[PDB]
Amino acid sequence: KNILKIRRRKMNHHKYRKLVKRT
Amino acid sequence: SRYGPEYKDPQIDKEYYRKPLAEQTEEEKYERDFKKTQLIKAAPATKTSSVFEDPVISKFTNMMMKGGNKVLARSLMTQTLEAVKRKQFAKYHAASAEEQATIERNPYTIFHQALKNCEPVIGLVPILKGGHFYQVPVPLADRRRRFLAMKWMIAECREKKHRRVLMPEKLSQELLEAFHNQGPVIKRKHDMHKMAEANRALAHYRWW
Amino acid sequence: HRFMEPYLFGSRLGQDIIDLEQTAAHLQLALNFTAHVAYREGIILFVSRHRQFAHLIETTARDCGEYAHTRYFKGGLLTNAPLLLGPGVRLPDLII
Amino acid sequence: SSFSIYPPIPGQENSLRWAGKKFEEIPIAHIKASYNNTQIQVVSAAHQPLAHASCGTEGFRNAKKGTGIAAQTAGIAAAAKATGKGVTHVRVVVKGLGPGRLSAIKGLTMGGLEVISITDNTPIPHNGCRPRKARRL
Amino acid sequence: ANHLKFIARTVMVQEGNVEGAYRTLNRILTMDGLIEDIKRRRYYEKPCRRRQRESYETCRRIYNMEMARKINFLMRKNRADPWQGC
Amino acid sequence: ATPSLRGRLARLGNPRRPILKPNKPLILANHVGERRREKGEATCITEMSVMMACWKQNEFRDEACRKEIQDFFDCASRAEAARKMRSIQENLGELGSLPPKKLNKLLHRFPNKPHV
Amino acid sequence: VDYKNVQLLSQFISPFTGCIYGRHITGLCGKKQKEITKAIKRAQILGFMPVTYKDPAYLKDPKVCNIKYRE
RNA sequence: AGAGUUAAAUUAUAACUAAGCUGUAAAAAGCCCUAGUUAAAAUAAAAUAACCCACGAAAGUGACUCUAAUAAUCCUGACACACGAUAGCUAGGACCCAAACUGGGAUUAGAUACCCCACUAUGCCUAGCCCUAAACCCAAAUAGUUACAUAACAAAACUAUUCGCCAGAGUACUACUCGCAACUGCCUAAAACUCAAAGGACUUGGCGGUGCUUCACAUCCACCUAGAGGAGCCUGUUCUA
Ligand SMILES: [Mg+2]
Ligand SMILES: [Mg+2]
Ligand SMILES: [Mg+2]
Ligand SMILES: [Mg+2]
Ligand SMILES: [Mg+2]
Ligand SMILES: [Mg+2]
Ligand SMILES: [Mg+2]
Ligand SMILES: [Mg+2]
Ligand SMILES: [Mg+2]
Ligand SMILES: [Mg+2]
Ligand SMILES: [Mg+2]
Ligand SMILES: [Mg+2]
Ligand SMILES: [Mg+2]
Ligand SMILES: [Mg+2]
Ligand SMILES: [Mg+2]
Ligand SMILES: [Mg+2]
Ligand SMILES: [Mg+2]
Ligand SMILES: [Mg+2]
Ligand SMILES: [Mg+2]
Ligand SMILES: [Mg+2]
Ligand SMILES: [Mg+2]
Ligand SMILES: [Mg+2]
Ligand SMILES: [Mg+2]
Ligand SMILES: [Mg+2]
Ligand SMILES: [Mg+2]
Ligand SMILES: [Mg+2]
Ligand SMILES: [Mg+2]
Ligand SMILES: [Mg+2]
Ligand SMILES: [Mg+2]
């Protein structure tokens, strides 16, 4: 329900961390 | 089911109706039977008041029957009984006084003893657990064990004979072999008991 | 019940004692009204759902020449009169 | 008839004998009942091992030996090997909570052996070592 | 371990009937929660899971207690009714 | 006695921190639950194992042991009679308590009031 | 309540286990349930009273607790 | 916060005894320097009480003993000052047991997962960092009222004094800045551009490899009988023609 927002942020952060690792 | 649930099954026994005066609870019982204005199913064509008919012989007869033939199956039953009789007379007159006291010439008591010897004690049911099918030992009801006995008899004496050999011959052979416990039918019952012991732990899977 | 407090004389050891001065003052006016209604020829209905005094009340109303509903009250009885009771009807001018 | 559930303390004068022996002199049957297996060992009161029987010793295998039937079989086998060394009575000590608890006990009874007291000593930490993690994360 | 053996969690069999003795024992252990605790300690339960379990159990107990109380309070009125077909 | 409800739940007035977090509100319902049917387990397993030991010893001749076979049969008959006759009496008699239906009717006669 | 007297204390202990009974069993004011508990723990570690069972000597003392094991 | 202590486990380690032990829905792998019983330090963790509701500002705190000790004659208040779960970092010490990682074993179409075994960082102690949590009781602090009064749901509705915050959704716990023992960090926090919605509660359905009851009467399983699927033909489809 509200989890949809949390899911967006979750994904963003994950992606970003992965990115920092690569870069 | 052309009979409503109102219809009771008939009691064909003559001895029950002939000698009523010595029993109170049964007098009261069949008093309540007829006086209830209870409808009775018409007595079957197979069943008679005959003093000569064995319900077990009749069941085995039915179980032999292929198609609609009561005639041919009653024929093969009659012939098998006669064949057991004469086989035991041939065994009787070639023997000595001791073995003439021992040997049984009644094809009826040989039938009943062969089937009592051939009936299994315990059985196997498949049970699904964790996506696998395990064969589990199950205690059996009486009727199931009688059935299994008869069906095993007819199965073997249908299947394993040479095509030249007639049915009453093979059946009398196996009746007399299962009387003495040495027949392949009792070997089947033993395969069942050994497969029931091999799996005995799995008896916990049974929830009833 | 919260609205009952102005009618209470007080509470004696956990039991609530109704002030009977006010009870008399009220019952006076109630009986006054009820009689005036019966005088002007109008329908009085005795309603109670309690099963002890059901019979007693039905008896009472029969003996006043008045009507009594002591039974299960059917849902649309007063609101939808014409369907439950009939094509056109008169409704009780007072209910007790 | 006055019967106490509680056992006979050693320093007490209490007189009860099973084949003439004090409660303390009776051999002890240790039954370790664990979810995958049941082990039984009958021992002297002096802690000298008399008899050992397990569900593995009894010729079962992996899953099978968990069951109560196997526990009973091991109990019978144990009671046989023990009566062979001539123990009439025994005090049962049950260690563990599993499928083979009661089965192994009455399998000792069935194996021609007499049980007098039945004790439960199951490890119960008052919080020692942290146990392994829960299944199905 | 350092305590004296055989004094605790021990039941003496009466008249040779073992099943009843074991039953008495199991009832004892269940009474003191020892069984639930043996079972719960097979796997570690993380402190928050524990906290949750305790809170739920207490709520459950409150509800059950209160329901049983209204039951026994109301039990009198299960008698055959006086006013039938009134 | 009932465990105290004072200061347990999270409320605007309450000084301290929650003890109980109720999943669903604590209010007495006007009905009870339906009794949970007992989980069945295997029956006659003991007499079976006895009989199977008998067989393994005597080489599966039935004539050898007539006692264990007969007692396993007897036990299975008592298990059938159990299954049939216990269903009805367990479904009716609750002993000291009442069947859930009568309990529910009773409760509906004296309902919980959340409202007003 | 004194840690030194093991009798009064072991009244509130389960004979078979050595557990401490709760309020619903002993039936005490919170104050005294607390007191009994703290006392029991102290007496247990100071070496006055055994932890894993009730001391046999005190078995036949008056039973004040509401629990019934044997039925 | 110090210092001292240990009941229940558990283990090094022997002594007997047994060939297996462990492990799952089921097995395999692992181990037989194994297992059961009898002995036992260290380490770590603190059954029951607790159906209690205390202490602390919060984080937190529930084995025992003692020492020290819980600001303000009590309004609000920062970016200043001092703290701050778990994880993590540096250095030294500990290591029972647990366990990211990793390696084996199963599972599976695959299985870099769920399940099994082994073992590590790590959890512990000392000292120093790091300063984040769904750090949420998603309900600010201090005084009050139960008057007016139900969006919905939830923990009923409100006054007064304050401080902190909030101006559609994404982009974004992002880029660029300042500061910071942090250098894959924290903090502070945009815009281009994209969209016409994004959201919160509910209603009735449908569905659920969700739970509890009750069933299936040729009907699911258990079970009975005869057939089909293999042969030849008959006849119909599909292709190819
Ligand atoms: Mg995104
Ligand atoms: Mg998770
Ligand atoms: Mg506080
Ligand atoms: Mg909720
Ligand atoms: Mg320190
Ligand atoms: Mg120790
Ligand atoms: Mg060491
Ligand atoms: Mg292997
Ligand atoms: Mg402790
Ligand atoms: Mg202060
Ligand atoms: Mg201030
Ligand atoms: Mg920190
Ligand atoms: Mg280090
Ligand atoms: Mg390590
Ligand atoms: Mg491990
Ligand atoms: Mg792997
Ligand atoms: Mg650390
Ligand atoms: Mg928190
Ligand atoms: Mg917040
Ligand atoms: Mg503030
Ligand atoms: Mg924007
Ligand atoms: Mg963050
Ligand atoms: Mg950033
Ligand atoms: Mg900038
Ligand atoms: Mg069908
Ligand atoms: Mg055909
Ligand atoms: Mg075919
Ligand atoms: Mg064909
Ligand atoms: Mg066509």
Number of CB atoms found within 10 A of residue D90's CB: 26
Residue B203 near chain D (CB below 8 Å)? yes
CA nearest neighbour of B201 among D70, D106, D61, D11: D70
Resolution of the experimental model, in Å, one decimal:
3.2
CA gap C50, B30 in Å, rounded: 52
Structure tokens at B28: 């009261």
Residue length, chain B?
A: 208
Cβ neighbours for B86, distance < 8 A, ≥ 6 positions apart:
none
Q: Which nucleotide is nearest to A1 (CA to C1')?
A: H200
Identify the burial level of D40 via C-beta atoms within 10 angstroms of its C-beta, where 0-12 means exposed, 13-18 middle and 19 or more buried: buried
* H-helix or E-strand spanning residue D37: strand D37-43
SS3 annotation, B121-168: CEEEEEEEECCEEEEEEEECCHHHHHHHHHHHHHHHHHHCCCCCCCHH
Structure tokens at D45: 């009161």
CA gap B104, B108 in Å, rounded: 10
Q: Could you give the 3-state DSSP secondary structure of residue D28?
A: strand
Q: CA triplet B196, B198, B203: central angle to 5 degrees?
A: 60
Q: Are F32 and F104 in contact (CB under 8 A)?
A: yes
Number of domains chain F contains? 1
DSSP string, C5-32: GGGEEEEETTEEEE-HHHHHHHHHHHHH
CA nearest neighbour of B115 among B139, B87, B84: B84
For chain C, helix (H) and strand (E) counts, in that order, are 3, 5
> Ligand 1 being an ion, which residues bring their Cβ within 5 A of it?
A 12
Q: Could you give the 3-state DSSP secondary structure of residue B39?
A: coil
Cα A17 → chain centroid: 8
Q: Which nucleotide is nearest to B151 (CA to C1')?
A: H224
Q: Are strands D114-120 and D49-54 parallel, antiparallel or unpaired?
A: unpaired
If phi > 0 it is left, if psi is from -120 to 50 it is alpha, else beta; for residue D30 that is beta
3-state helix, strand, coil in chain C (%, to 5): 45, 20, 40
CA gap D32, D102 in Å, rounded: 12
Structure tokens at A8: 């967006």
For chain F, helix (H) and strand (E) counts, in that order, are 3, 0
CA gap G51, G8 in Å, rounded: 15
3-state helix, strand, coil in chain F (%, to 5): 45, 0, 55
Beta-bridge partners for B128: B133
Number of CB atoms found within 10 A of residue B138's CB: 18
CA gap B40, C76 in Å, rounded: 54
**Residue D121 backbone phi and psi in degrees, to 5:** -110, 100
**Alpha carbon separation from G58 to A18, B126, G11, G49, G70 (Å, rounded):** 68, 57, 8, 11, 19
Kindly report the bases of strand H lying within 7 A of a protein C-beta atom: 5-10, 16-28, 35-40, 44-56, 59, 63-65, 96-100, 114-117, 123, 134, 137-139, 154-156, 170-174, 184-185, 199-201, 212-214, 221-226
**Alpha carbon separation from F91 to F34, F83, F85 (Å, rounded):** 11, 12, 10
- What residues make up the domain containing F2? 1-116
Residues making up the binding site of A: 12
CA gap E76, G1 in Å, rounded: 43
Number of CB atoms found within 10 A of residue B58's CB: 15
Q: CA triplet D42, D43, D46: central angle to 5 degrees?
A: 165
Terminal alpha carbon distance of chain B = 32
**Alpha carbon separation from D31 to C83, D96, D106 (Å, rounded):** 80, 8, 12
Residue D116 near chain F (CB below 8 Å)? no
Q: Are B43 and B9 in contact (CB under 8 A)?
A: no
Of all residues in chain F, the one with the smallest CA distance to B196 is F52
Identify the burial level of B189 via C-beta atoms within 10 angstroms of its C-beta, where 0-12 means exposed, 13-18 middle and 19 or more buried: buried
Number of domains chain G contains? 1
Q: Are B157 and B76 in contact (CB under 8 A)?
A: no
CA G35 to C1' H69 (Å) is 23
* CATH number for the domain running over D2-137: 3.30.420.80
Radius of gyration of the CA atoms of chain D, in A: 17
DSSP string, G17-66: T-PBP-HHHH---HHHHHHHHHHHHHHHHTTSS-SSS--GGGTTS---S-
CA E22 to C1' H44 (Å) is 35
G19 labelled ligand-binding: no
Q: Which of residues 36-55 of E touch strand H (CB under 7 A)?
A: 37, 44, 54
State the Cα torsion G60-G63-G67-G71 to the nearest 10°.
50
Beta-bridge partners for B183: none
CA gap G23, G29 in Å, rounded: 8
* Chain F residues touching residue B190 (CB < 8 angstroms): 60
CA G41 to C1' H5 (Å) is 14
**Alpha carbon separation from G34 to B44, G1, G22, G47, G55 (Å, rounded):** 83, 10, 10, 20, 22
CA nearest neighbour of E67 among C71, F82, F80, F112: F112
CA nearest neighbour of B111 among B59, B49, B48: B59
* Chain D residues touching residue G59 (CB < 8 angstroms): 6
CA gap F48, F68 in Å, rounded: 8
CA gap D9, B121 in Å, rounded: 51
**Residue F53 backbone phi and psi in degrees, to 5:** -65, -45
Number of CB atoms found within 10 A of residue E38's CB: 16
| Cβ contact F49–B122 (<8 Å) | no
- What residues make up the domain containing G48? 1-71
Identify the burial level of G65 via C-beta atoms within 10 angstroms of its C-beta, where 0-12 means exposed, 13-18 middle and 19 or more buried: middle
Q: Are D26 and D89 in contact (CB under 8 A)?
A: yes
Q: Between chain G and chain C, are at least 3 CB pairs below 8 A?
A: no
3-state helix, strand, coil in chain E (%, to 5): 60, 5, 30
